[PDB]
Amino acid sequence: MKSVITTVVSAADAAGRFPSNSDLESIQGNIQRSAARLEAAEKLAGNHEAVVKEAGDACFAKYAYLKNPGEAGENQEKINKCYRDVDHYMRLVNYCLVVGGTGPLDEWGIAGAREVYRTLNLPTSAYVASIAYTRDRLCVPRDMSAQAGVEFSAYLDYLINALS
Template sequence: MKSVVTTVIASADAAGRFPTTSDLESVQGSIQRAAARLEAAEKLGNNLDNVAREAYDACIKKYPYLNNDGEANSTQVFKDKCLRDIKHYMRLIQYSLIVGGTGPLDEWGIAGQREVYRALNLPTAPYVEALKFARNRGCAPRDMSAQALVEYNALLDYTINSLS
């Protein structure tokens, strides 16, 4: 899984050398920023269900046609699955906050995303709307510290870009 540490080790290994001072500096830099990331991960993890629910409600409000017969949010089973998908993205964002890179989102969320949504005939715009709502909903210092919010929003933006 790609992170600062694994990238440093992979390049040291490719050259067959021990970790150098500059390698250790890179790791130190990532560790210094870890406090904000872990704070965001903790706050998101503690409130993940509510965050996902609000984002889901916002996207259904913007695209009410999804409730029509035959559309993606028409039955209870479909509704549950839509909400589950938003929770899924939020969980992967939490993982990425922990790792300090986009590895979990890339490997478990974005890879194959387009193909799956096309195969299931799902529109991507509502996902974007849900994540955009979450992107604008976070507030410092109410929800988390300013630096933590920066890290959290960056990953939401990354996910939105992957869908648009």
């Protein structure tokens, strides 16, 4: 759970000091920008069951060769394990704009994620064909406020650049 204020107080443990004025002023900025993203949370979290039906096949419009005989998205027990798993990555980033830090990113989608994609023989470039289409689907008029798709947009291509 990497966060904003857990990132602050740890060096005051690691160097062993007391909380001064310099340590608390970082969370004065955790008033304004903490608020502006939390509107975009439930705006996404109420509709996470709907946006997966255009997010999943956005990979499969690009990669329909994963439905070949002897493949990764070939059949219905893998298809319904695909359509179940595309929003798990968003529930990671649903909690990202809840705490404000990158907690469930660096806790549940990093360690060995480069490994088990190669080890379970599923393409690493497949999810980036599934979720960039979600990030490149931004109409700031009908989505949210102006700044609410600024930090929120930066997560959805962080997983693009971290995973591959």
